[PDB]
């Protein structure tokens, strides 16, 4: 299966995906990395790995729909099967999401359905949970509400900050994002007709 990875920053999850998809038994290949922001570390990671990059700055398009269209055109250019959002911090439009329904994955640094949104660690710390974690899910129109593929729990330690907690949770993200990609790319897991997760 041919994979696009969308990023907005550092790209530690991108690197984990690059590493996993180069294993001999990988059912996924990363054929394009797309960033909405320029000069981000994730782009260096892709180039260093010999993967094509495209920057599509969302601040030259009149609205959300035509920004996504610019993404979609590139996805078509590279005959993409699966899209991974890996620290991509832009909300995608309804039609774009519907087109890629069952073919687009996202990593989120909480145990969904807890702490939806862009500041999950802040929320987890404010709430006072002693167990948080991360989630890979299919992307649906409503943010962080799509069908869950894998999760991993991660303890919160006394005195944690966003810095120390995100560091711990990223270790788990780097495990379940590649595992989830392999499950979907091999056809082992799919979004079923009834919308629920189907394990074939
Ligand atoms: N349809 C859709 N479903 C998803 O499940 C999903 C997950 C994504 C991956 C990211 C999920 C977390 C996230 C939340 C909010 C924001 C955020 O700040 N959004 C802004 C607009 C974009 C921006 O300016 O940043 C806003 O609405 O104000 C950034 C990131 S994108 C996505 N799109
Ligand atoms: N879905 C919103 C969100 O908070 N995403 C988070 O952004 C980070 C990107 O790190 P990376 O650039 O090193 O992969 C990841 O921790 C991911 O869970």
Number of Cβ atoms within 10 Å of the Cβ of 77: 12
Binding-site members for (6R)-10-formyltetrahydrofolate are 64, 89-92, 106, 140-144
Estimate the crossing angle of helix 12-21 against helix 162-185, to 10 degrees: 30
Query: For residue 23, how far is its CA from the centre of ligand 1 (angstroms)?
Result: 31
Q: Using what technique was this structure determined? A: X-ray
Number of Cβ atoms within 10 Å of the Cβ of 167: 12
Give me the domains of the chain, ranges plus CATH numbers: 1-200 (3.40.50.170)
Mutate to test the pocket of ligand 1, among 8, 89, 104 (most ligand atoms within 8 A of CB): 89
Phi-psi region at 106: left, alpha or beta (left = phi > 0; alpha = psi -120 to 50): beta
Note the ligand closest to the C-alpha atom of 92: 1
Q: Does the beta carbon of 102 lie inside 6 Å of ligand 2?
A: no
Q: What atom of ligand 2 comes closest to residue 87's alpha carbon?
A: 9
Q: Is 108 a catalytic residue?
A: yes
Distance CA 131, CA 114 (A): 11
* Phi, psi of 57, deg, nearest 5: -75, 115
Gyration radius of the chain's alpha carbons = 16
Estimate the crossing angle of helix 12-21 against helix 41-49, to 10 degrees: 20
Contact partners, residue 147, CB within 8 Å, separation at least 6:
137, 138, 140, 191, 195, 196, 197
Residue nearest to atom 9 of ligand 2 (CA): 87
CA 80 → CA 10, 119, 136, 149, distances in Å? Answer: 23, 30, 19, 20
DSSP structure string for the chain: -EEEEEESS--HHHHHHHHHHTSTT-S-EEEEEEESSSS-HHHHHHHHHT--EEE--GGGSSSHHHHHHHHHHHHHHTT-SEEEESS--SPPPHHHHHHTTTSEEEEESS-TTSS-SS-HHHHHHHHT-SEEEEEEEE--SSTT-SPEEEEEEEEPPTT--HHHHHHHHHHHHHHHHHHHHHHHHTTSEEE-TTSSEEE-
Q: Does the beta carbon of 170 lie inside 6 Å of ligand 2?
A: yes
Q: Does the beta carbon of 178 lie inside 6 Å of ligand 2?
A: no
């Amino acid at each position: 299966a041919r994979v696009a990875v969308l990023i907005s920053g550092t790209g530690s999850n991108l690197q984990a995906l690059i590493d996993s998809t180069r294993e001999p038994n990988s059912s996924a290949q990363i054929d394009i990395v797309i960033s909405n922001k320029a000069a981000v570390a994730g782009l260096d990671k892709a180039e260093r790995a010999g993967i094509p990059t495209r920057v599509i700055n969302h601040k030259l398009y009149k609205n959300r729909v035509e920004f996504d269209s610019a993404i979609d055109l590139v996805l078509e250019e590279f005959s993409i099967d699966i899209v991974c959002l890996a620290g991509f911090m832009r909300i995608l439009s309804g039609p774009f999401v519907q087109k890629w329904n069952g073919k687009m994955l996202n990593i989120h640094p909480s145990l969904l359905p807890s702490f939806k949104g862009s500041n999950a660690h802040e929320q987890a710390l404010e709430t006072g949970v002693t167990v948080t974690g991360c989630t890979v899910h299919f992307v649906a129109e409503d943010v962080d509400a799509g069908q869950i593929i894998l999760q991993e729990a991660v303890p919160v330690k006394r005195g944690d900050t966003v810095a120390t907690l995100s560091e711990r949770v990223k270790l788990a993200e780097h495990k379940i994002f590649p595992a989830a990609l392999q499950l979907v790319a091999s056809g082992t897991v799919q979004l079923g007709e009834n919308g629920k997760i189907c394990w074939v």
